[PDB]
């Protein structure tokens, strides 16, 4: 075997006498300190490593190793699984040093901000948004004092990041005032004869308003963000703006326009960052979102699992980013295997997401509600596909508890007249249909349809799903056939208008319509709908021949200017 490097041998020999050289490792060159601490992690000395990474003196010299940063993202995660609250301790140490340094000159305070920017960016990359927000709040407090142009530029650069850490933590009410403050600093900086590139801020506001289910405002602000993309922007900012604009276009029924945006975002992420980077994982996750919302589910699982494997290898175990990848892949495997009933893998991913989130986030957090709702959806179909009625009454009761928790969280945060609570009402209607509570299921589905028609137009994907649910409740169970006829027709119209004739839910809609017309006496229509369903199945079998979504982007498809200009000229 090849001999071990003298660098690695000396690292092994300096770790071993760790107490005799603990204070001397901190005086090593900054690229040897991280290697020594990575040897501490590799040796299993997590207890000795936690006492070193909890000091901002030591962690600052570790954050400046950028090649081996993906290694640190694992080590810093392991300590947070080890029980060492490294993120909160580092945020508290930074806040303390900011309090001690606020009464000093602007030259030294700027260096404390730059240490703050990299630390806060690391904590927001790692997913500790509750602890990255403290660091960015301290940086904003440092920038607030002096009113010169440099301090205003640093303050807007920390408010385009404070908005990001208040969106991953689901604090949109604080996010609105953060964007207001960033806009105030931008206006003040513009009044002093200088312009700041407001692409990252508008992209973060697009993410906030899409997460708040304000798809019209989200689309407007993503258009305004894409107007501000230049050539000199960092690749991270361009990727984030492309990704959020793609999500806004998808939820605004612009699948032909979001395709190029998200494919170019994925290309940029795989080109600059690489195939094993958390930003590439984020782009893959939202690419899977786009593919899942364009009835391309058969490969969406192939994209979330690619996104999860990147996040689970870089971010270790109990991380919110791994939890988000799990709760997203659990919902795709729920959809991809809805016609197969093999939800064992989908349930495995769904209970893994809640197992992570309940450990690291409080019980009163929105991001727990989405994980609970996916597991509740999977438990619905497992209950209706088993045989024991005790299981059918236990799984459905657990799903009821999960949906009530999700509904109360979304109602407390978003409100009553939003879209997330509307689809929670739709899911409650589905669950009550499964629980033979047909009157309350009808009430829930009527509420969901009312809220979604009030907001999401009249021919949208979500209102189509809710209409299909209510119509299946009327037809298959409540036997109100004349009411279900118009709802089937509207669902067919929306599905054909949006996704064409290849929509997956068209199968369930056609089957319900066939039974509807069979139980009323329109038998020739029943036969014509059998042959329509056969044509649909043949068309879906033909459409099954689609290559993997990671090969559609190919190598160098377009560039940023072409895609941005195409989106801009396309309204």
């Amino acid at each position: 075997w090849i001999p071990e490097t003298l660098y690695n041998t000396a690292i092994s020999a300096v770790v071993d006498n760790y107490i005799r050289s603990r204070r001397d490792i901190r005086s090593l060159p900054e690229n040897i300190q991280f290697d020594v601490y990575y040897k501490l992690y590799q040796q299993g000395r997590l207890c000795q490593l936690g006492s070193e990474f909890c000091e901002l003196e030591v962690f600052a010299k570790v954050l400046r190793a950028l090649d081996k940063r993906h290694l640190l993202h694992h080590c810093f995660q392991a300590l947070m699984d080890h029980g060492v609250k490294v993120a909160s301790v580092l945020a508290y140490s930074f806040s303390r040093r900011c309090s001690y340094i606020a009464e000093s000159d602007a030259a030294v305070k700027e260096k404390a901000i730059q240490v703050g920017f990299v630390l806060g960016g690391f904590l927001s990359d790692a997913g500790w948004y509750s602890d990255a927000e403290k660091v960015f709040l301290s940086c904003l407090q440092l920038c607030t004092l002096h009113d010169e142009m440099l301090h205003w530029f640093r303050a807007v650069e920390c408010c385009v990041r404070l908005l990001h850490v208040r969106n991953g933590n689901c604090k949109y009410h604080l996010g609105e005032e953060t964007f207001k403050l960033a806009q105030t600093y931008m206006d003040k900086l513009s009044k002093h004869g200088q312009q700041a590139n407001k692409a990252a801020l508008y992209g973060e506001l697009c993410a906030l308003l899409f997460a708040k289910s304000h798809y019209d405002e989200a689309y407007k602000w993503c258009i305004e963000a894409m107007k501000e993309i230049t050539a000199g922007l960092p690749v991270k900012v361009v990727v984030d703006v492309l990704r959020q604009a793609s999500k806004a276009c998808v939820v605004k029924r612009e699948f032909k326009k979001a395709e190029q945006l998200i494919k170019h975002a994925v290309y940029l992420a795989r080109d600059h960052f690489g195939s094993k980077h958390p930003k590439y994982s984020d782009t893959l996750l939202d690419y899977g979102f786009y593919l899942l919302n364009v009835d391309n589910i058969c490969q969406s699982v192939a994209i979330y699992q690619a996104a999860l494997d990147i996040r689970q290898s870089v971010f270790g175990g109990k991380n919110i980013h791994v939890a988000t990848a799990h709760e997203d892949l659990a919902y795709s495997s729920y959809v991809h295997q809805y016609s197969s009933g093999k939800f064992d893998n989908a349930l495995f991913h769904a209970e893994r997401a809640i197992g992570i989130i309940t450990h690291i986030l409080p019980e009163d957090h929105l991001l727990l509600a989405s994980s609970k709702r996916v597991k509740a959806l999977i438990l619905e179909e497992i209950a209706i596909d088993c045989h024991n009625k005790e299981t059918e009454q236990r799984l459905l009761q657990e799903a009821h508890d999960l949906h009530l928790s999700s509904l109360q969280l979304a109602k407390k945060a978003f409100g009553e007249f939003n879209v997330q609570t509307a689809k929670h009402y739709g899911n409650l209607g589905r669950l009550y249909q499964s629980m033979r509570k047909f009157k309350e299921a009808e009430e829930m589905h009527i509420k969901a349809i009312q809220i979604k028609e009030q907001l999401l137009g009249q021919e949208d994907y979500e209102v189509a799903l809710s209409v299909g649910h209510l119509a299946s409740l009327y037809n298959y169970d409540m036997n109100q056939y004349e009411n279900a006829e118009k709802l089937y027709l509207r669902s067919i119209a929306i599905g054909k208008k949006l996704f064409g004739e290849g929509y997956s839910g068209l199968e369930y809609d056609y089957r319900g319509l066939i039974k509807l017309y069979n139980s009323i006496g329109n038998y020739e229509k029943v036969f014509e709908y059998h042959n329509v369903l056969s044509n649909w199945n043949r068309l879906r079998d033909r459409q099954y021949s689609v290559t993997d979504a990671l090969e559609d982007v190919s190598t160098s498809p377009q560039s940023t200017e072409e895609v941005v200009q195409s989106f801009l000229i396309s309204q």
Binding site: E462, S466, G468, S472
Partner: peptide, 9 residues
């Protein structure tokens, strides 16, 4: 399979 799928995550 009397129903459709669930809305969003």
């Amino acid at each position: 399979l009397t129903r459709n799928k669930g809305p969003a995550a």
